Design a protein around this motif. Sequence first.
Motif, PDB file in Angstrom:
ATOM      1  N   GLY A  79       0.949  -1.057   0.066  1.00  0.00           N
ATOM      2  CA  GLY A  79      -0.121   0.011  -0.125  1.00  0.00           C
ATOM      3  C   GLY A  79       0.846   1.253  -0.139  1.00  0.00           C
ATOM      4  N   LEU A  80       0.573   2.313  -0.711  1.00  0.00           N
ATOM      5  CA  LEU A  80       1.178   3.407  -0.904  1.00  0.00           C
ATOM      6  C   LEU A  80       0.621   4.608  -0.174  1.00  0.00           C
ATOM      7  CD1 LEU A  80       2.285   3.147  -4.480  1.00  0.00           C
ATOM      8  CD2 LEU A  80       3.620   2.789  -2.478  1.00  0.00           C
ATOM      9  N   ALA A  81       1.102   5.176   1.015  1.00  0.00           N
ATOM     10  CA  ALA A  81       0.259   6.158   1.687  1.00  0.00           C
ATOM     11  C   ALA A  81       1.150   6.981   2.242  1.00  0.00           C
ATOM     12  CB  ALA A  81      -0.575   5.288   2.515  1.00  0.00           C
ATOM     13  N   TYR A  82       0.504   8.310   3.036  1.00  0.00           N
ATOM     14  CA  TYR A  82       1.186   9.214   3.896  1.00  0.00           C
ATOM     15  C   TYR A  82       0.437   8.435   5.199  1.00  0.00           C
ATOM     16  CZ  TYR A  82       1.496  12.010  -0.071  1.00  0.00           C
ATOM     17  OH  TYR A  82       1.818  12.670  -1.397  1.00  0.00           O
ATOM     18  N   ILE A  83       1.345   8.168   6.075  1.00  0.00           N
ATOM     19  CA  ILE A  83       1.124   7.784   7.316  1.00  0.00           C
ATOM     20  C   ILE A  83       1.190   8.420   8.339  1.00  0.00           C
ATOM     21  CG2 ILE A  83       2.059   5.939   9.330  1.00  0.00           C
ATOM     22  CD1 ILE A  83       1.391   5.106   5.509  1.00  0.00           C
ATOM     23  N   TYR A  84       0.243   8.460   9.380  1.00  0.00           N
ATOM     24  CA  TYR A  84       0.090   9.788  10.686  1.00  0.00           C
ATOM     25  C   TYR A  84       0.132   8.857  11.672  1.00  0.00           C
ATOM     26  CZ  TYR A  84      -1.089  12.854   6.866  1.00  0.00           C
ATOM     27  OH  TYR A  84      -1.270  13.574   5.784  1.00  0.00           O
ATOM     28  N   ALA A  85       0.885   9.268  12.765  1.00  0.00           N
ATOM     29  CA  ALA A  85       0.890   8.762  13.931  1.00  0.00           C
ATOM     30  C   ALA A  85       0.148   9.975  14.955  1.00  0.00           C
ATOM     31  CB  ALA A  85       2.363   8.374  14.399  1.00  0.00           C
ATOM     32  N   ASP A  86      -0.605   9.826  15.436  1.00  0.00           N
ATOM     33  CA  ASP A  86      -1.493  10.775  16.159  1.00  0.00           C
ATOM     34  C   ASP A  86      -1.409  11.979  15.328  1.00  0.00           C
ATOM     35  OD1 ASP A  86      -0.058   9.159  19.338  1.00  0.00           O
ATOM     36  OD2 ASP A  86      -2.225   9.059  18.381  1.00  0.00           O
ATOM     37  N   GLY A  87      -1.770  11.998  14.253  1.00  0.00           N
ATOM     38  CA  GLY A  87      -1.934  13.456  13.498  1.00  0.00           C
ATOM     39  C   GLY A  87      -0.610  13.766  12.953  1.00  0.00           C
ATOM     40  N   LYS A  88       0.547  13.217  13.429  1.00  0.00           N
ATOM     41  CA  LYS A  88       1.960  13.727  12.626  1.00  0.00           C
ATOM     42  C   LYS A  88       1.966  13.055  11.720  1.00  0.00           C
ATOM     43  CE  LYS A  88       3.639  15.886  16.789  1.00  0.00           C
ATOM     44  NZ  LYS A  88       4.354  15.905  17.833  1.00  0.00           N
ATOM     45  N   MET A  89       2.596  13.516  10.330  1.00  0.00           N
ATOM     46  CA  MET A  89       2.890  12.754   9.113  1.00  0.00           C
ATOM     47  C   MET A  89       4.285  12.097   9.318  1.00  0.00           C
ATOM     48  SD  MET A  89       3.245  13.131   5.288  1.00  0.00           S
ATOM     49  CE  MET A  89       2.171  14.767   5.190  1.00  0.00           C
ATOM     50  N   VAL A  90       4.438  10.791   9.433  1.00  0.00           N
ATOM     51  CA  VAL A  90       5.578  10.127   9.570  1.00  0.00           C
ATOM     52  C   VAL A  90       6.415  10.454   8.477  1.00  0.00           C
ATOM     53  CG1 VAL A  90       6.790   7.843   9.870  1.00  0.00           C
ATOM     54  CG2 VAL A  90       4.527   8.191  10.778  1.00  0.00           C
ATOM     55  N   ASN A  91       6.172  10.405   7.268  1.00  0.00           N
ATOM     56  CA  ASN A  91       6.819  10.830   5.921  1.00  0.00           C
ATOM     57  C   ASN A  91       7.605  11.952   6.278  1.00  0.00           C
ATOM     58  OD1 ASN A  91       4.078   9.403   5.314  1.00  0.00           O
ATOM     59  ND2 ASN A  91       4.694   9.079   3.414  1.00  0.00           N
ATOM     60  N   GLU A  92       6.643  13.098   6.793  1.00  0.00           N
ATOM     61  CA  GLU A  92       7.566  14.142   6.793  1.00  0.00           C
ATOM     62  C   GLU A  92       8.375  14.281   8.057  1.00  0.00           C
ATOM     63  OE1 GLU A  92       8.338  18.141   8.636  1.00  0.00           O
ATOM     64  OE2 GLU A  92       7.351  16.558   9.712  1.00  0.00           O
ATOM     65  N   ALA A  93       7.857  13.630   9.245  1.00  0.00           N
ATOM     66  CA  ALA A  93       8.964  13.567  10.339  1.00  0.00           C
ATOM     67  C   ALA A  93      10.034  12.958   9.994  1.00  0.00           C
ATOM     68  CB  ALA A  93       8.172  12.650  11.317  1.00  0.00           C
ATOM     69  N   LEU A  94      10.244  11.980   9.242  1.00  0.00           N
ATOM     70  CA  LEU A  94      11.541  11.453   8.900  1.00  0.00           C
ATOM     71  C   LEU A  94      12.498  12.369   7.983  1.00  0.00           C
ATOM     72  CD1 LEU A  94      10.371   7.710   7.801  1.00  0.00           C
ATOM     73  CD2 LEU A  94      12.397   8.118   9.458  1.00  0.00           C
ATOM     74  N   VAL A  95      11.827  12.944   6.958  1.00  0.00           N
ATOM     75  CA  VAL A  95      12.543  13.790   6.171  1.00  0.00           C
ATOM     76  C   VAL A  95      13.009  15.092   7.182  1.00  0.00           C
ATOM     77  CG1 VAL A  95      12.170  15.594   4.120  1.00  0.00           C
ATOM     78  CG2 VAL A  95      11.264  13.237   3.951  1.00  0.00           C
ATOM     79  N   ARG A  96      12.027  15.549   7.951  1.00  0.00           N
ATOM     80  CA  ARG A  96      12.510  16.648   8.656  1.00  0.00           C
ATOM     81  C   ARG A  96      13.823  16.360   9.471  1.00  0.00           C
ATOM     82  NH1 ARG A  96      14.720  20.242  10.640  1.00  0.00           N
ATOM     83  NH2 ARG A  96      13.771  21.984  11.753  1.00  0.00           N
ATOM     84  N   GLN A  97      14.084  15.302   9.885  1.00  0.00           N
ATOM     85  CA  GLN A  97      15.290  14.545  10.753  1.00  0.00           C
ATOM     86  C   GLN A  97      16.525  14.502   9.721  1.00  0.00           C
ATOM     87  OE1 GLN A  97      15.455  14.884  14.012  1.00  0.00           O
ATOM     88  NE2 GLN A  97      13.398  15.363  14.062  1.00  0.00           N
ATOM     89  N   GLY A  98      16.180  14.563   8.432  1.00  0.00           N
ATOM     90  CA  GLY A  98      17.409  14.214   7.587  1.00  0.00           C
ATOM     91  C   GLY A  98      17.674  12.582   7.668  1.00  0.00           C
ATOM     92  N   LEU A  99      16.555  11.751   8.060  1.00  0.00           N
ATOM     93  CA  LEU A  99      16.538  10.555   7.955  1.00  0.00           C
ATOM     94  C   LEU A  99      15.971   9.841   6.830  1.00  0.00           C
ATOM     95  CD1 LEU A  99      16.042   9.898  11.658  1.00  0.00           C
ATOM     96  CD2 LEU A  99      18.145   9.514  10.650  1.00  0.00           C
ATOM     97  N   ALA A 100      15.266  10.491   5.868  1.00  0.00           N
ATOM     98  CA  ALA A 100      15.124  10.195   4.704  1.00  0.00           C
ATOM     99  C   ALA A 100      15.144  11.448   3.511  1.00  0.00           C
ATOM    100  CB  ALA A 100      13.314   9.895   4.591  1.00  0.00           C
ATOM    101  N   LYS A 101      15.408  11.004   2.502  1.00  0.00           N
ATOM    102  CA  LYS A 101      15.288  11.884   1.192  1.00  0.00           C
ATOM    103  C   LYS A 101      14.100  12.012   0.608  1.00  0.00           C
ATOM    104  CE  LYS A 101      20.190  11.073   0.383  1.00  0.00           C
ATOM    105  NZ  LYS A 101      21.110  10.429  -0.431  1.00  0.00           N
ATOM    106  N   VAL A 102      13.507  13.001  -0.086  1.00  0.00           N
ATOM    107  CA  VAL A 102      12.402  12.936  -0.983  1.00  0.00           C
ATOM    108  C   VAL A 102      12.835  12.145  -2.231  1.00  0.00           C
ATOM    109  CG1 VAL A 102      10.722  14.258  -2.380  1.00  0.00           C
ATOM    110  CG2 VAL A 102      11.284  15.068  -0.057  1.00  0.00           C
ATOM    111  N   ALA A 103      11.944  11.275  -2.770  1.00  0.00           N
ATOM    112  CA  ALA A 103      12.404  10.184  -3.485  1.00  0.00           C
ATOM    113  C   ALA A 103      11.049   9.657  -4.169  1.00  0.00           C
ATOM    114  CB  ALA A 103      13.102   9.280  -3.011  1.00  0.00           C
ATOM    115  N   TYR A 104      11.339   8.991  -5.296  1.00  0.00           N
ATOM    116  CA  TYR A 104       9.986   8.169  -5.904  1.00  0.00           C
ATOM    117  C   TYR A 104       8.904   8.816  -6.257  1.00  0.00           C
ATOM    118  CZ  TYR A 104      12.959   3.991  -4.799  1.00  0.00           C
ATOM    119  OH  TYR A 104      14.198   3.287  -4.756  1.00  0.00           O
TER     120      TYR A 104
END
Length: 132
Positions: A79-104
Amino acid sequence: LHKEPATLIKAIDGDTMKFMYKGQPMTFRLLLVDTPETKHPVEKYGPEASAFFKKMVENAKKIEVEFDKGQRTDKYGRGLAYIYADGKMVNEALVRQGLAKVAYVYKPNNTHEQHLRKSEAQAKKEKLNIWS
Ligand SMILES: Cc1cn([C@H]2C[C@H](OP(=O)(O)O)[C@@H](COP(=O)(O)O)O2)c(=O)[nH]c1=O
Ligand SMILES: [Ca+2]
């Protein structure tokens, strides 16, 4: 777009997880990001990204998935999604920490692309993790 509930079964790595979704176990993969590899034949920050994702989803009261406007699964059946943990987007949280790159970035599933890029640009300016 709308948010739908899901239940964590297992965190797999920085960007992939197993969820119970509408009563069936399903693998999900975060849209628009790539955490460093730890499985396929270990990239720097892979274990860090994996730990951050795991902690954020395991500790949540409520997990939601938000599909984008196009394909809801990839060619591996994830499944391809934006995932939210208690309303916080996990996709953004990882990117914001420099632990993921925008990709794909595959149109039409690019609704949150600019939002994510803004977070990436801040992580980079702050010289965090992958940008350090
Ligand atoms: C995030 C994402 C990945 N994928 C595919 C592209 C890559 O396929 P290939 O493996 O064939 O290169 C793979 C990247 O996922 P991972 O980063 O989990 O490996 O998943 C999509 O098709 N759509 C998506 O939105
Ligand atoms: Ca990855």
